[PDB]
Design a protein around this ligand. Structure first.
Ligand SMILES: [Mg+2]
Lengths: 122, 70, 75, 99, 118, 103, 44, 101, 778, 52
RNA sequence: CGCCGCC
């Protein structure tokens, strides 16, 4: 459940590469007009700069957003990233989904709305 | 005239030889150019009459693309 | 002839190895006691690859009936 | 990380702890040892020679022979079922269900 | 945040190719006989006659400094690789490049196979 | 595979008794697995009535152990000379006698 | 001399071992020299 | 790198009968530190051994580059043993905290 | 075949009762010489392959591909080759089962079964065809893919053992002719120094190999347990209709590993010929081996007159350069034994009127005595028991002050060198198959190597197209035009530059192309001038039609017939070739085929640039993206797109091919027109792809569309989405039916009549003869 | 066409039979073979029963 | 300096 969504977003790309879906309609055409991507399952040792260092491989992230908690916490586990280009988000959701950093396996998906301060999946 | 003029030179290096009057480009980019020219014409019709483009049958798209009186 | 070859071959083998222990080991002292202060000191792109599979000939057997010419299509 | 108590808890019995040059070869001492066992049975893959290792040697059933080779004639049967032709499959399978 | 920049770029090159240029460019054109005279065109002995060495200025999109010279992996969308993109991935760009090259090879075999007894 | 069980050996004996020697397609026409090549191969390799398929003598063994030293391989050249002549009966003799001269 | 004294067969010493002029006539037709030259010219 | 390859073990088949004690110590301490060896007693298992290390990379050194290596004149085949069983589950161990850490 | 097989069992029977033809001393000498050569080479012998051998599946896959290649047509036989490919695919689906069966077969089985013999009727030529039963064929194809890899890894074979994996024309010139003008002062001739090439065959080398000596020789280099295998397969009962005879003396060369046996025995025969000191000077010290004709340290080149040596499979080419007193010694040592002056109207160019008389060898008494003397000296030091070097099928030619002109035939096609220093005016060297040679130590051009096609090569081509005319009764029209094509591309992509100069072959192509033109026309019962226009033939099959690659419409040249045989005269009076003059101008095939010396000069610069940009991209840290395409990605003689292919890692182990390909003429009967390359290792050596488009524009794009029934093809309006038959001519296992006789071997009438339907307006035109016409009923 | 050298066949042929009729004829043929061999051996104990 | 035409 917390990382079978990793398997589901991977099965998306594996079924597209199985069926041979052209890139005009290869599901990233719905998450156009949004350079934002939801990270998931980061370890709590990850600062803003380390996340920029790992996810800047496909472009320098313009707008990061960690969910640092209000007073008692320091980090909850998400992050939102807004790159230069939307195709960097396509590259990042294909390539950085299911990689694992210091134990826990992380996941990436598109956002398509905005920086939601807390809605998404803990 | 404007956007069809810029379509027919799809590269920065799309020379025409002097004894020809249309550009010289391969057949792959001929069908690419023909697709974006028919999308130009259909978009101009859909903007002119405020009609949804994908609502049209292919006989209707035929009649627009040869300019039949509709 | 086999036995009068093999022994001879093996004989030369011993004496070659014997000169080894007389040459290189000797040079070892010439390499150990260095009398000047002995111890008193391509990324190939993935897009090139796999563009042609095969392991056959292409000139299939020698069958001269089967339209080998013109590697790529017409229209 | 192990200790010797877990180590002999792990292993089965029947075991005890304790340039270049040209010359020639000679006629050997017949380095023609068996690698596939003594019969028609099936072929053995290189991973199955731990499970069916005891079939590569012939028992000649005496002096290593309690009733236990009768209870590892089933080793021959599992090999015939797992890797065999389907007549050998249904023969060994009927034989193992009937006994 | 940069797709809009390239939309501005394609609209300004659109403006210059539309409002002033005629429909056809010939071989002369007074612009492509600048580009032939400004090509790299490797195999020039006079290259190090005029250049000192392959040095680095502030050569970047923004005035912020660009990434250094290790090799970023080829990734189908040519990136603004910067701030330490050292090759961690699930291995998908290599996967799809091998996949499409295998497609382009098996069509080359499918032609030969299809055309045999004709 | 060429397994050659008994119920085709005896039918091959009957067929060679009926049809003849240089006529093998006509007797491979009644065996349901075998071709004429395999019929020739067995009837000269195992079923020939001249084959002395037992009785290892003492004269032929002292013959072959310095006949298979003259030409060291080649058990089809020295098979008619020995006359044990199955060309693998010779190889059986030679490997058995070089086991018994080793033990 | 002084050119090929390391070769093995320093002389075969004879060409045909006497000479080559026969014009003889075997009529056993597989052994006739006409059939020998025929069956070394064409098959190889 | 390589999880799904069982190590600290190495099955040894087609090993000579003249192995008194020493030659397995030779070949298997040649590549690194050893835990021990298992020497068979049944004339099947006589001529077939186990060797266990304290290192993984030494077992990789052995099985990557001793496959079909010819020795005293019968070439041996190496594999990785499969640990699957036991005979006695060990019980009443204390193994208390005892302030070691 | 009756006559060969009974002569062969007479000679196998007379091997046994007449003893070995080789003496005890005569074989101990060969054996001692090989152990001296091998221990001077430090050649570690081949081990028997372990079952856990690393590069082992990678060789079984090569053997199965090299065997599965022989089945691409599928009218295949009742059991024998269906069970052969059944064995191949069972070896595929379980490689380790077959790979254990090979080791079991290969330690312990040495009594094998029948092999059958047939003969290719090559029309003045018969080659045997040996078929082995397939369960052995898998094991010995693994064995030669192992031994060739394992002996080129350890470099058993010296550089002169050809064909190596260069190519056959770099063997012919740009290693060889470049090798014979880069010697130290090749032509000097002011101290009587004279060059001479010898060219001969080791005669009957395949038969005169006794398996006893062979077994004792090739267990110096191989594990003994498969030396016994390799000499135990070599005697099995050959078979025919009735005629079982055993083998004992000759080897049967239909065995898969016969290339290894023939060339290792050729190695020991070479170091009988060269001696052993010159052979170690040529092959160089083992710590730094030599290339094909390069040496170390040209003082080593200066001594021992045999300068260079290249042995193709059973055929030696020696170049020895004598100073005058040594040639004097050798001539008078020849003349101690042979009286009778002017016995010299025989040597070489006396009947071989391929070159003009000034270009032929002059038969001056010193040069003819020298040539026959050095043939006498290479005819011995090679005993009659192992091979022989016959005089008649051999050929020796000599350069001196009386002979300006060094002639020789190499590796298929015959050439001659005329140096620049001995022509009055410079012979042109910039026109045709003429390519010039240059002394690379001083960068200037020095010689001219004029090329021609051999006489026996155009004889082999003419008998090739003669048998396609002979099997014209059993195939369709499109198959024999397809077969004429593959024969022509076989001739012309190999003899590239040399087909231009050889006038007698350009007459032959015009003669043969028109003869298959006529053979198709008599199948329609037509032969008529305008009832069958040349639009029908030269239109590619993609539109339809037959599609045949012209070389006849070429305007074959002439010269003055009186002075033709005398002297290279020049050119006058073009003679019209094929009989078509209406200004259609059908394109030649030669202009779409990139010439040879252009191809080698592309190869040098492309591999230089490729090594240059490899060390550039390692000097930087970038990646090679498409800077491997300025060379079109397919220049270079091993063709840069060959490194970057799907099976680089296994075709690194297909080693010792190009000799295996040549030895497959003693296996499957299809005479291979492309024996010298195959696409996977040295690329596609020709891209004739715009011959089709230039043919369209030589005839029109609506060319035959005026003649083909397109207008009632249908209302097909467009003609460009047109597409032909696709449907199941392969027809994998068809629906595996019973096929009486005439439906098994007869010719398929239906493509033959849909082609005839397709051109029905121009095959049935109303006004050629306007007399009798017959209307069908209804 | 070679009307002389094509692999011939006769009109109205009916063709070569399928596997069932062919091996049924093989079993009848083999029956006649074994019957005549035991007739030559003059075996008095061979009996064929009411069902073949 | 210009083969060829089929029952
Ligand atoms: Mg008839």
């Amino acid at each position: 459940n917390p990382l079978t969504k990793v398997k589901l977003i991977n099965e998306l790309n594996e079924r597209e590469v199985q069926l041979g879906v052209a890139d005009k309609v290869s599901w990233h055409s719905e998450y156009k007009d949004s350079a934002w991507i939801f990270l998931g399952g980061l370890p709590y040792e990850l600062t803003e700069g380390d996340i920029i260092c790992v996810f800047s491989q496909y472009g320098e992230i313009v707008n990061i957003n960690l969910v640092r908690d209000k007073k008692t916490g320091k980090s909850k586990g998400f992050c939102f990233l807004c790159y230069e280009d939307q195709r960097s988000t396509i590259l990042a959701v294909d390539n950085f989904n299911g990689i694992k950093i210091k134990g826990r396996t992380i996941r990436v998906d598109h956002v398509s709305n905005y920086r939601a301060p807390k809605d998404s999946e803990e | 005239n404007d956007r069809a003029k810029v379509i027919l030179k799809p590269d920065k290096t799309t020379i025409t030889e002097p004894h020809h009057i249309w550009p010289t480009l391969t057949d792959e980019e001929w069908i690419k150019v023909e697709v974006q020219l028919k999308d130009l014409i259909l978009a101009d019709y859909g903007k002119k009459n405020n009609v949804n483009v994908a609502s049209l049958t292919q006989s209707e798209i035929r009649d627009i693309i040869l300019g039949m009186e509709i | 002839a086999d036995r009068k070859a093999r022994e001879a071959v093996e004989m030369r083998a011993q004496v070659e190895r014997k000169m080894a222990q007389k040459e290189k080991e000797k040079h070892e002292e010439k390499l150990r006691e260095m009398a000047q202060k002995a111890r008193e000191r391509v990324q190939y792109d993935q897009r090139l690859f796999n563009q042609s599979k095969g392991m056959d000939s292409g000139f299939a057997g020698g069958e001269d009936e089967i339209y080998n010419v013109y590697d790529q299509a017409w229209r | 990380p192990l200790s010797d108590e877990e180590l002999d808890a792990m292993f089965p019995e029947g075991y005890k702890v304790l340039t270049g040059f040209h010359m020639q070869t000679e006629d050997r001492t017949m380095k023609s040892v068996n690698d596939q066992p003594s019969g028609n049975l099936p072929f053995l893959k290189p991973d199955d020679i731990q499970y069916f290792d005891k079939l590569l040697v012939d028992v000649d059933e005496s002096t290593l022979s309690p009733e236990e080779q009768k209870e590892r004639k089933i080793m021959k049967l599992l090999l015939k079922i797992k890797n065999g032709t389907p007549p050998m499959r249904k023969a060994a399978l009927r034989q193992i269900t009937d006994k | 945040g940069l797709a809009q920049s390239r939309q501005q770029q394609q609209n300004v090159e659109d403006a210059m190719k539309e409002m002033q240029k005629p429909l056809a460019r010939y071989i002369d054109d007074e612009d492509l006989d600048r580009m032939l005279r400004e090509q790299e065109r490797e195999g020039d002995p006079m290259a190090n006659f005029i250049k000192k060495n392959k040095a680095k200025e502030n050569k970047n999109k923004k005035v912020r400094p660009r990434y250094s010279g290790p090799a970023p992996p080829p990734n189908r969308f040519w990136p603004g690789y910067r701030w330490d993109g050292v090759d961690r991935s699930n291995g998908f760009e290599q996967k799809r490049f091998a996949r499409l090259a295998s497609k382009k090879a098996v069509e080359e075999l499918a032609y030969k196979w299809s055309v045999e007894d004709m | 595979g060429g397994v050659w069980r008994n119920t085709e050996d005896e039918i091959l004996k009957a067929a060679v008794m009926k049809y003849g020697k240089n006529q093998w397609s006509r007797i491979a026409s009644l065996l349901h697995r075998k071709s004429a090549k395999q019929c020739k191969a067995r009837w000269y390799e195992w079923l020939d009535p001249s084959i002395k398929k037992t009785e290892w003598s003492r004269e032929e063994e002292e013959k072959l152990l310095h006949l298979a030293k003259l030409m060291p391989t080649q058990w089809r050249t020295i098979a008619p000379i020995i006359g044990r002549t199955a060309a693998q009966c010779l190889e059986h003799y030679e490997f058995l006698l070089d086991k018994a001269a080793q033990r | 001399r002084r050119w090929d004294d390391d070769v093995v067969f320093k002389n075969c010493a004879k060409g045909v071992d006497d000479q080559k002029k026969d014009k003889r006539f075997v009529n056993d037709t597989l052994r006739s020299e006409f059939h020998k030259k025929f069956m070394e010219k064409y098959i190889k | 790198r390589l999880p799904p390859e069982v190590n600290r073990i190495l099955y040894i088949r087609n090993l000579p009968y003249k192995i008194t004690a020493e030659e397995m110590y030779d070949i298997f301490g040649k590549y690194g530190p050893i835990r021990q060896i298992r020497v068979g007693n049944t004339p099947e298992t006589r001529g077939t051994a186990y060797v266990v290390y304290e290192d993984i990379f030494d077992a990789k050194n052995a099985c990557d580059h001793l496959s079909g290596f010819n020795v005293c004149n019968r070439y041996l085949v190496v594999l990785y043993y499969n640990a699957n069983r036991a005979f006695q589950k060990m019980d009443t161990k204390k193994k208390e905290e005892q302030l070691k850490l | 075949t009756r006559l060969y097989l009974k002569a062969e069992q007479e000679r196998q029977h007379n091997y046994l009762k007449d003893g070995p033809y080789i003496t005890a001393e005569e074989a101990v000498a060969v054996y001692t010489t090989t152990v001296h050569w091998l221990e001077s080479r430090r050649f570690s012998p081949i081990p028997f392959p372990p079952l856990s051998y690393k590069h082992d599946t990678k060789l079984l896959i090569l053997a199965l591909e090299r065997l599965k290649e022989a089945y691409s047509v599928k009218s295949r036989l009742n059991q024998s080759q269906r069970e052969e490919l059944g064995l191949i695919e069972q070896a595929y689906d379980n490689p380790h089962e077959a790979l254990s069966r090979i080791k079991r077969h290969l330690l312990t089985q040495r009594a094998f079964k029948e092999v059958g013999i047939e003969f290719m009727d090559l029309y003045s030529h018969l080659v045997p065809v040996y078929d082995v039963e397939p369960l052995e064929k898998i094991t010995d194809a693994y064995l030669d893919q192992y031994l060739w890899y394992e002996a080129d890894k350890r470099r058993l074979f010296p550089p002169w053992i050809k064909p190596a994996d260069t190519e056959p024309p770099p063997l012919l010139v740009y290693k060889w002719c470049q090798g014979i003008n880069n010697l130290q002062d090749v032509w000097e001739t002011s101290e009587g120094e004279c060059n001479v090439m010898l060219e001969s065959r080791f005669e009957k080398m395949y038969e005169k190999i006794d398996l006893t000596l062979l077994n004792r020789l090739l267990r110096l280099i191989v594990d003994h347990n498969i030396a016994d295998y390799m000499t135990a397969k070599n005697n099995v009962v050959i078979n025919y209709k009735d005629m079982n005879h055993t083998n004992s003396y000759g080897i049967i060369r239909g065995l898969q590993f016969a290339s290894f046996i023939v060339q290792y025995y050729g190695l020991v025969m070479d170091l009988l010929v060269l001696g052993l000191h010159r052979a170690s000077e040529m092959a160089g010290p083992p710590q730094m081996p030599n290339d094909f004709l390069s040496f170390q340290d040209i003082a080593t080149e200066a001594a021992h007159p045999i300068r260079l040596f290249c042995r193709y499979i059973d055929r030696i080419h020696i170049f020895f350069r004598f100073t005058a007193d040594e040639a004097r010694d050798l001539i008078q040592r020849y003349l101690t034994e042979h009286p009778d002056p002017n016995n010299e109207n025989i040597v070489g160019y006396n009947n071989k009127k391929c070159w003009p008389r000034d270009a032929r060898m002059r038969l001056m008494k010193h040069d003819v005595n020298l040539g026959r003397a050095v043939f006498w000296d290479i005819k011995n030091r090679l005993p009659r028991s192992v091979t022989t070097v016959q005089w008649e099928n051999s050929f020796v030619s000599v350069y001196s002050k009386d002979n300006p002109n060094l002639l020789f035939n190499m590796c298929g096609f015959e050439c001659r060198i005329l140096p620049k220093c001995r022509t009055s005016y410079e012979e042109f060297t910039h026109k045709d198959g003429v390519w010039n040679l240059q002394n690379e130590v001083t960068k200037e051009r020095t010689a001219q190597c004029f090329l021609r096609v051999d006489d026996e090569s155009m004889q082999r081509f003419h008998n090739r197209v003669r048998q396609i005319l002979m099997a014209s009764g059993s195939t369709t029209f499109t198959k024999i035009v397809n077969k004429w094509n593959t024969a022509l591309i076989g001739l012309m992509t190999y003899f590239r530059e040399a087909v231009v100069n050889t006038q007698e072959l350009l007459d032959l192509l015009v003669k043969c192309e028109n003869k298959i033109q006529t053979r198709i026309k008599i199948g329609l019962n037509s032969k008529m001038p305008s009832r069958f226009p040349p639009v029908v033939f030269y239109t590619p099959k993609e539109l339809g039609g037959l599609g045949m690659l012209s070389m006849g419409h070429v305007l074959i040249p002439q010269s003055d017939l009186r002075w033709s045989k005398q002297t290279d005269v020049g050119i006058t009076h073009f003679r019209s070739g094929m009989s078509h003059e209406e200004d259609q101008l059908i394109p030649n095939l030669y202009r779409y085929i990139q010439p040879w010396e252009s191809e080698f000069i592309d190869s040098q610069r492309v591999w230089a640039e490729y090594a240059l940009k490899r060390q550039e991209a390692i000097a930087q840290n970038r990646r090679l993206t498409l800077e491997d395409l300025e060379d079109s990605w397919d220049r270079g003689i091993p063709r840069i797109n060959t490194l970057f292919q799907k099976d680089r890692h296994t075709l690194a182990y297909d080693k010792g091919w190009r000799v295996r390909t040549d030895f497959k003429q003693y296996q499957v009967l299809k005479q291979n027109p492309f024996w010298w390359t195959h696409q996977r290792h040295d690329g596609k050596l020709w891209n004739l792809n715009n011959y089709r488009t230039d043919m369209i524009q030589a005839l029109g794009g609506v060319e035959g569309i005026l003649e083909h029934t397109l207008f009632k093809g249908t209302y097909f309006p467009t003609w460009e989405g047109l597409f032909w038959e696709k449907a199941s001519g392969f027809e994998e296992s068809m629906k595996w039916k019973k096929l009486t006789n005439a439906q098994r071997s007869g010719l398929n009438q239906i493509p033959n009549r849909r082609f005839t339907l397709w051109w029905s307006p121009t095959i049935n035109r109303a006004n050629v003869y306007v007399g009798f016409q017959v209307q069908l009923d209804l | 066409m070679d009307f002389q050298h094509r692999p011939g066949g006769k009109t109205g042929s009916g063709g070569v039979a399928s596997s069932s009729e062919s091996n049924r004829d093989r079993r009848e043929r083999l029956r006649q073979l074994a019957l005549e061999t035991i007739d030559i051996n003059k075996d008095p104990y061979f009996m064929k029963n009411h069902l073949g």
